[PDB]
Amino acid sequence: EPNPTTIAFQVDCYLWHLKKTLSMMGEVDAPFEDRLRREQKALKGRSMTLGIDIQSATQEGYYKIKSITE
Amino acid sequence: PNPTTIAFQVDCYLWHLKKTLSMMGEVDAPFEDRLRREQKALKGRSMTLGIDIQSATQEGYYKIKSITE
């Protein structure tokens, strides 16, 4: 019985860190990095609702993505 | 290269990840709402780019693993 709403937040947080990383690396286009600015305001708003640290959650998301793949 | 294509590859493979989690029943309904809405977006971009989703997925996989940790 793990918690879907928390996993979702963690995964969204990590995926954002992954997507952002590629933008850091100049490998993506402007709309991609625009969805990135907005997704960021989104997670903050969600971070504040759930009361869950984003740095903390990125870690867990990273873990979850790794388990279903690699 | 090029940035629009990479971005499409990443989006598609990331979508495949999100759906996998959706199927595992490990994410909630809004995440699944985002997933279903995104799907119709990606089909738009695919017929705009001339890039089939399956193949952009395959590509997306290798691209992300190379930055994974």
Side-chain angles (χ1 to χ4, degrees):
Chain A
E1 44 255 28
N3 189 297
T5 297
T6 287
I7 294 172
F9 182 67
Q10 299 161 341
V11 168
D12 281 340
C13 271
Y14 175 62
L15 291 202
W16 186 92
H17 162 73
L18 265 193
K19 282 180 165 179
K20 187 68 173 177
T21 295
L22 297 159
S23 172
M24 197 273 307
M25 295 163 69
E27 299 196 26
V28 286
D29 63 352
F32 190 97
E33 74 202 23
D34 182 71
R35 301 191 278 276
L36 231 37
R37 287 179 225 109
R38 288 150 57 226
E39 235 287 340
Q40 191 279 314
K41 300 191 180 168
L43 303 170
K44 158 90 172 319
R46 290 165 64 193
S47 181
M48 283 174 307
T49 308
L50 307 152
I52 298 184
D53 181 43
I54 290 182
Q55 172 205 331
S56 167
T58 301
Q59 192 168 238
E60 299 303 312
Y62 158 76
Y63 295 140
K64 221 92 190 183
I65 289 308
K66 267 242 299 187
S67 78
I68 71 134
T69 63
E70 142 194 13
Chain B
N2 69 337
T4 278
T5 290
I6 306 303
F8 185 65
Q9 287 165 5
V10 169
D11 285 330
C12 279
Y13 171 78
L14 274 199
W15 189 92
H16 174 81
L17 293 195
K18 295 170 158 201
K19 182 198 102 79
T20 301
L21 277 161
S22 168
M23 301 191 325
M24 293 170 47
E26 293 200 355
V27 293
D28 62 353
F31 185 107
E32 275 162 355
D33 184 76
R34 281 186 299 278
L35 187 76
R36 160 171 17 88
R37 288 171 146 70
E38 188 183 350
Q39 177 157 45
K40 236 219 308 185
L42 288 179
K43 253 192 73 168
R45 286 160 72 186
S46 182
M47 54 177 97
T48 293
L49 295 175
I51 308 173
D52 62 296
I53 289 177
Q54 166 217 32
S55 171
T57 307
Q58 164 158 68
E59 229 56 80
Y61 167 85
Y62 294 104
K63 187 49 180 183
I64 269 163
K65 259 201 70 58
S66 74
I67 63 163
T68 272
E69 102 188 311

